[PDB]
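A reminder before we start the practical. When you read a complex entry, don't treat the lines as separate problems. The point of joint prediction is that each chain is placed relative to the others, so the output describes one connected object in space. Small molecules and nucleic acid strands, if listed, are placed in the same frame. In the example below there are three entries. Take a minute to note the order of the lines before looking further.
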Amino acid sequence: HSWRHIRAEGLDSSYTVLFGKAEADEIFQELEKEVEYFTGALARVQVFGKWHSVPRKQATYGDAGLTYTFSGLTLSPKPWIPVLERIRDHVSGVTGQTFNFVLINRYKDGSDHIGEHRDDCRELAPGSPIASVSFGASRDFVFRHKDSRGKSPSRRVAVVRLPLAHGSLLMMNHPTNTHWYHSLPVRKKVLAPRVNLTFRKILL
DNA sequence: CTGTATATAGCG
DNA sequence: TCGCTATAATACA
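Here is the predicted structure of the whole assembly.
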């Protein structure tokens, strides 16, 4: 109900805290108990011609039949579990949006990270918002405009930086993900784990 | 003078 | 400790 609006050219997101500390703690504990992360061949991706194990853990849950593909890796969704349905439904209630899929990224500490990218799958329903819900350690989240990259950038739109707190929701609305890359950079001083859930509308 | 795109290495 | 550019080899359009 009270949102910090994050706006810039082609950037339209909003940030709010959904859950107090006690409730966020319970949910975090239950996520740590219940979520099953991919391992092995389902945790390696191909970027710039080389394969790497991802510097974090990932899981996908959602409706049957959906798939999620990026960087040479295809993930199939595990059936929904109660903790994930409760979060999905709370976010849906607060936003008026619906989601049929969630990507979970877990960062064991500040050395786990995710590189710059846009969430612009073919399988992502056109114009649908992405709901990013975070539990555990606060981590810095960075938005960067496509045109501001690489030595002599075309222009210089300033980076937008947000800490995402325990129990928070970041809604990324169209067309944020057509124009802006995001990442979760390494933060060596962070010692504790963070679990991020990104709820999405995926096309069958 | 001139295609576009994408995890760590190797700097500074 | 952080953040910059270049780019593991292709795959396009």
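Discuss with your neighbour: Residues 45-52, 54-55, 71, 115, 117 of chain A lie near DNA strand B (CB under 10 Å from a C1'). What might explain this?
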